[PDB]
Design a protein around this ligand. Structure first.
Ligand SMILES: [Mg+2]
Ligand SMILES: [Mg+2]
Lengths: 150, 147, 49, 152, 147, 49, 147
């Protein structure tokens, strides 16, 4: 495998933190959580593709191991379709009306819930939380800068 | 490739384990060579050298026993540092617990202060702000009188 | 493309909360583990007085 | 066990309190604890009871208990425990809202779904000699004091 | 107020239950329909900058108060009159000094039931709605006594 | 008690017709006619303006 | 995929070679073990009164070296643990700076937010009070039109 052992040890240590799985295994639905916590930013489509296009019911009746999870993360790191933050900060400007580097939080919540891969109301609230202001607007630039540092 | 890659990982671990056993067996086999050579040379020894070496065994035995003191002392520092490290790691954890609450406390103070400060200013933003609608309505009402 | 960073930021943030929370539970169960055998210690309840 | 300096185990305040207690629990102060002094202390504390079963524990330690042996046997059993401030800080992690009480079922689930899995019997044993409200609510802020046996 | 700790807040329940009470206290059955709202309302639901509901202000316009005094044939007055007369028990009847339907002269049509509706249950529903809204028992007792 | 905007939901009494009307029915009809006139206005006249 | 299969299949050859190579040490160790017992047993028969001390000498030499390795290994763990606690201690000290810069540091920031509120309420009240004066002019205009 084209992956050093130094970071592999830390990856194994992080994967062993779940525990709640019977033993050294991992569920299909919980695979994305461990894949996104270690690093990278895979999408739902990418997760379903690397997982071999699992069935709807297969996401809760089977479990994988680490020998199969390592190549998944390897491919996600090597092969990816993400992009830098320069394109993200410029994409959110489409919703800016006045053009003063601010956008309404409700519009961002709606765009995140409907447009794209859709997100639950529990996640969008935590995402937009903290950036509350008097005018109810959230600077997309600061939002992207904070999300990139996460 | 991903499925076959798992076989390489299992084979790599087995190769490393097999290679480790070869190195361990090499040291064991090499030890027998030196041990066997000492047996043949010990039989043809002069004799007096055997008794002389015994005098050094008691001195060397004390060194092995003395090593237990350093081993226990080294383990003590390792256990003392590890034991103290747990209290140090829990210190940052305890401070981190308050750090998360202290951070929210500052927001609570601002939210608590605003509950009264913004409340008093909000009053001016109600009857006085309503004057804006009344002022705008006054122009409309005055427009009716002007009409 | 941006939703992935938002989803990963939550998993990373939630993972960090679980990492520190897991270590916090260790001190809780550890403090309660020795407390069990220590609870029934005749010399403890007598000294606490 | 981990043999080492018995003074480095307990904190300054802890070792000071232990020494002050050893200097007090002694009808005839002389650096030597016997069964007579313990029996007299128990008789004075519990209104003159007599528990002859406590004498079966002297065999654990080499002969009578000495202040050094006393600190040693205190440290061998108090290992792993921490002060009350750090315990409260760690407890503050859960709840978040900081209500001072947590559900008993939630605590049982937490104590058996991460780290050292505690059996149901071990979790139930922690409630066979303490009060509890009918509406649940595990008063942790108040249970911290009972944990140190600072009552009865 | 949707968020991670999603839960049916008290404001939503109050806004939902404020409509039945007003209906029971204003609506009345007519020949055109069994639920004829004899009053026009204007619910002013306020919204903050974030879009979450924060308050509601209802304003009634034109209250047909003349219906409680006299009605027409094959019609009924305010539903509260029948709800109280039905759901009232022994203690409530003795306290409010209620009487049968044929005794009151305001009820020209007497006791008229609505198809698929039981006043005994509607009274309990209205009482539960009032209790959930935030009205104490003394205010409800005073309202029943005034009725 | 603070809001940036609001949504005023109206539900006045519809057109009421009985064998014997009174002042209440007259007021209801007047309100219905006013609402219909405002609707027709906002639909046709404001657009042309 | 073929490269991974070839690499995985090629890795099996290395594992097989290691097992075959390590197998020689296993058979060689077994043969040396049998010869070691013969030389050791034959040595004691020639003169166990003097050769007995020689057997302990070889074990003492290996034990002395083992004690050194244990002490050296403990040093690598002691220094690592002693240095690891320094990282955690430095982290606690480094985090302590954030305790006064984030938590305690928010005092000047949290107070600024509260102080800004006191300054915003005054500015808001000033604009509201100043705007209220315009209502008098607007009301005066409406009142002036009435005259
Ligand atoms: Mg004594
Ligand atoms: Mg109606």
């Amino acid at each position: 495998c084209d992956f050093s052992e130094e970071q592999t040890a830390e990856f194994k240590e992080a994967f062993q933190l779940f525990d709640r799985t019977g033993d050294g295994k991992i569920l299909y639905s919980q695979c994305g959580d461990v894949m996104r916590a270690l690093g990278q930013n895979p999408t739902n489509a990418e997760v379903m593709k690397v997982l071999g296009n699992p069935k709807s019911d297969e996401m809760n009746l089977k479990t994988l191991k680490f020998e199969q999870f390592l190549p998944m993360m390897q491919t996600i790191a090597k092969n990816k379709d993400q992009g830098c933050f320069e394109d993200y900060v410029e994409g959110l400007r489409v919703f800016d009306k006045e053009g003063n580097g601010t956008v309404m939080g409700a519009e961002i919540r709606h765009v995140l819930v409907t447009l794209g891969e859709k997100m639950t109301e529990e996640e969008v609230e935590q995402l937009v939380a903290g950036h509350e202001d008097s005018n109810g607007c959230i600077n997309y630039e600061e939002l992207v800068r904070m999300v990139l540092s996460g | 490739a991903r499925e076959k890659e798992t076989k390489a990982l299992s084979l790599a671990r087995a190769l490393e384990e097999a290679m480790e056993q070869k190195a361990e067996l090499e040291r064991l086999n090499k030890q027998f060579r030196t041990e066997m050579e000492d047996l043949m040379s010990s039989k043809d020894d002069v004799g007096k050298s055997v008794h002389e070496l015994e005098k050094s065994k008691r001195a060397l035995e004390q060194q092995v026993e003395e090593m237990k003191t350093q081993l226990e002392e080294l383990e003590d520092e390792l256990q003392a540092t590890e034991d103290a490290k747990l209290r140090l790691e829990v210190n940052l954890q305890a401070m981190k617990a308050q750090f998360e609450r202290d951070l929210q406390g500052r927001d609570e103070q601002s939210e608590e202060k605003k509950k009264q400060l913004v409340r008093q200013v909000r009053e001016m933003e109600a009857e006085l702000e309503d004057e804006r609608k009344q002022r705008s309505m006054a122009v409309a009402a005055r427009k009716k009188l002007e009409m | 493309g941006f939703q992935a960073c938002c989803r990963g930021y939550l998993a990373r943030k939630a993972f960090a909360k679980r990492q520190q929370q897991l270590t916090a539970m260790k001190v809780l169960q550890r403090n309660c583990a020795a407390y069990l055998k220590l609870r029934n210690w005749q010399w403890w309840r007598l000294f606490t007085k | 066990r981990a043999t080492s300096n018995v003074f480095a185990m307990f904190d300054q305040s802890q070792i000071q309190e232990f020494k002050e207690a050893f200097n007090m629990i002694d009808q005839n102060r002389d650096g030597f604890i016997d069964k007579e002094d313990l029996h007299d202390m128990l008789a004075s504390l519990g209104k003159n009871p007599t528990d002859e079963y406590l004498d079966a524990m002297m065999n654990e330690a080499p002969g009578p208990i000495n202040f050094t042996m006393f600190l040693t046997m205190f440290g061998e059993k108090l290992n792993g425990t921490d002060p009350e401030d750090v315990i409260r800080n760690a407890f503050a992690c859960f709840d978040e809202e900081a209500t001072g009480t947590i559900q008993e079922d939630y605590l049982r689930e937490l104590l058996t779904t991460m780290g050292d899995r505690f059996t149901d019997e071990e979790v139930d044993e922690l409630y066979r000699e303490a009060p509890i409200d009918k509406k649940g609510n595990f008063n942790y802020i108040e249970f911290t004091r009972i944990l140190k046996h600072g009552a009865k | 107020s949707h968020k991670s700790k999603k839960d049916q807040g008290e404001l939503e329940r109050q806004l939902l239950q404020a409509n039945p009470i007003l209906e029971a206290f204003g609506n009345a059955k007519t020949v055109k329909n069994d639920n004829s709202s004899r009053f026009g309302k204007f619910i002013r639901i306020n919204f903050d900058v974030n879009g979450y509901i924060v308050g509601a202000n209802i304003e009634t316009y034109l209250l047909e108060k003349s219906r409680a005094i006299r009605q027409a044939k094959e019609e009924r007055t305010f539903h509260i009159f029948y709800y109280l007369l039905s759901g009232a028990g022994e203690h409530l009847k003795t306290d409010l000094l209620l009487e049968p339907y044929n005794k009151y002269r305001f009820l020209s049509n007497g006791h008229v039931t609505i198809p698929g509706q039981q006043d005994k249950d509607m009274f309990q529903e209205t009482m539960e709605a009032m209790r959930i809204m935030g009205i104490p028992e003394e205010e409800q007792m005073g309202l029943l006594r005034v009725i | 008690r603070q809001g940036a905007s609001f949504i005023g939901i109206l539900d006045i009494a519809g057109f009421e017709i009985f064998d014997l009307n009174s002042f209440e029915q007259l007021c209801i009809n007047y309100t219905n006619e006013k609402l219909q006139q405002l609707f027709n206005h906002t639909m046709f006249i404001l657009e042309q303006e």
